[PDB]
Amino acid sequence: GSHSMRYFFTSVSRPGRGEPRFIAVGYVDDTQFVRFDSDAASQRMEPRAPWIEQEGPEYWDGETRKVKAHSQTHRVDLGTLRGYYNQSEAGSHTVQRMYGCDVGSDWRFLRGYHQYAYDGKDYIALKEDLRSWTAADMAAQTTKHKWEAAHVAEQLRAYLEGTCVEWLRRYLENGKETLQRTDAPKTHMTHHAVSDHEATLRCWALSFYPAEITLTWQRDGEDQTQDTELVETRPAGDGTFQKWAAVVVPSGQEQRYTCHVQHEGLPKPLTLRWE
């Protein structure tokens, strides 16, 4: 099917407590494969998935060199942005940057992305054409004009359409057992009595990969959207994910309710009933 590679960078200033904290992580689909942390001891990009461990020292030295260079530019940016917004030297601020590429189910380039946030709000983003920018603020216009003048979009577009997807395809092949896999949800229901006239039915999906899943309840085949408690999909810690959906069922009505599970790992969508 379709795949993505994404890198996520966070820099946080720490006035009076030394250098800003800088953390970088990379993912292929929903699997993390590398990290860098400015505060940590190694000062190296580090593997976080088993398939990338075989890459070898030119890869690790080069990704270390590049990530340290990203760290420096984000350190400079914190200073620049405090100036653009006329903010005092005292407060902590946050810069975030995300970039990467998607390929379709033919493994060909589909979409590329590069966006930047300051203090949790959109700051500047590369448009879908990979040729122009969307600037949120008056302050971001300065950045937009500077990046237009230095032809930054052109350099990003070359990477997103070429290098990014080539390396995504490399990773998909080298990590085929981890990345071209699906783990189907293992499912069950629980039933707990709220009072003497109703009970909570909870539909569980566990140990699934990728994270994308649809869990719904129906009553007599009508969707119960407004009356379903649904939790955010959450990591198990072992590379798989979990979710549940619950409804409140009045007495004797359990047979009216069905839980429906849609997931790429399933041969057919599931319909589950308490019975």
């Binding site: 890198y7 590049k66 260079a69 400079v76 620049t80 970039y99 930047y116 290098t163």
Partner: peptide
């Protein structure tokens, strides 16, 4: 693989 070129806002 990371992008190799640098830019500043």
């Amino acid at each position: 693989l990371l992008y190799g070129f640098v830019n500043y806002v």
